[PDB]
């Protein structure tokens, strides 16, 4: 469900700029599947562009670059 | 040692022959263990009241109390035969071992 590079480069710059970084809110702004919006968002956590503040069994919330 | 159990249906007659047994045994200077209070067992039988299919689903709750009391006694059996014949009352069952 990974869209073209135009959506990927925007995710590398815009979704870290979001205040509430969540696989549910990014799916509404970029049309990403519920899995890839959560799976591909883990790479940004490994790069340090986002911070994982809560990772529950059925709840995942990330914060801005701070 | 002899362990005599007391299984009865009424508690008033159970503790009476139980107290009358230990008093008749302690007077002979015998080592009697305390009366162990076995957990009582109630016999629940939920039977429909009406002998037909007419009613408001009214049930009848029956019960039956079963009390057991353990009494141990380390003494010769010749001194306990007459003691078991003085605390016999209807309603309580005596089991000498």
């Amino acid at each position: 469900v990974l869209f073209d590079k135009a959506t990927y480069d925007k995710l590398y710059k815009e979704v870290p700029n979001y205040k509430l970084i969540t696989p549910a809110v990014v799916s509404e702004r970029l049309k990403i599947r519920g899995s890839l919006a959560r799976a591909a968002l883990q790479e940004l956590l490994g790069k340090g562009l986002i911070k994982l503040v809560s990772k529950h069994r059925a709840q995942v919330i990330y914060t801005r670059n701070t | 040692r002899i362990r005599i159990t007391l299984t009865s249906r009424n508690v008033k007659s159970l503790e009476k022959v139980c107290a009358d047994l230990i008093r008749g045994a302690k007077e002979k200077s015998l080592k009697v263990k305390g009366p162990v209070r076995m957990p009582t067992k109630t016999l629940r039988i939920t039977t429909r009241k009406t002998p037909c299919g007419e009613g408001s689903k009214t049930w009848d709750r029956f019960q039956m109390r079963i009390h057991k009391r353990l009494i141990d006694l380390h003494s010769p059996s010749e001194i306990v035969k007459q003691i078991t014949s003085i605390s016999i009352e209807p309603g309580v069952e005596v089991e000498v071992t």
């Binding site: - | 939920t46 408001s56 689903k57 009214t58 049930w59």
Partner: protein
């Protein structure tokens, strides 16, 4: 030289044994801060952050719980570690502080020191539960 005070929820009876050590709070051998209901984590740490960290550093209590359910055992633990602690302050220490700990627990939560008389009443025929009637 020890007091065993029980905490009774619906059916969970938690008896706490009180001894003195250096920062050891465990229940059924397992540590108190690592019980399965991670949601009810502060409920077990409830008599810790309002009673005094320095007043809770030299106390070692090991609880043994049985009966009830998951949440009922949680409230049985905090009922055991709280009452068994006050019983130590009143039997081995003075009452000047035994009433100090008593007042801070009551002003926050009464059920932290008084068990609830609420139990599951008997079911009646004609309905699914006690009062409902299908």
């Amino acid at each position: 030289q020890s007091v065993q005070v029980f905490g009774r929820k619906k059916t969970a009876t938690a008896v706490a044994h009180c001894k003195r050590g250096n920062g050891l709070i465990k229940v059924n051998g397992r540590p108190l801060e690592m019980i399965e209901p991670v949601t009810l984590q502060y409920k077990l740490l409830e008599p810790l952050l309002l009673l005094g960290k320095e007043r809770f550093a030299g106390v070692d209590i090991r609880v043994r719980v049985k009966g009830g359910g998951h949440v009922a055992q949680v409230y049985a633990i905090r009922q055991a570690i709280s009452k068994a602690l006050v019983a130590y302050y009143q039997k081995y220490v003075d009452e000047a502080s035994k009433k100090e700990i008593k007042d801070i627990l009551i002003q926050y939560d009464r059920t932290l020191l008084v068990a609830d008389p609420r139990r599951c009443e008997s079911k009646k025929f004609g309905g699914p539960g006690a009062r409902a009637r299908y």
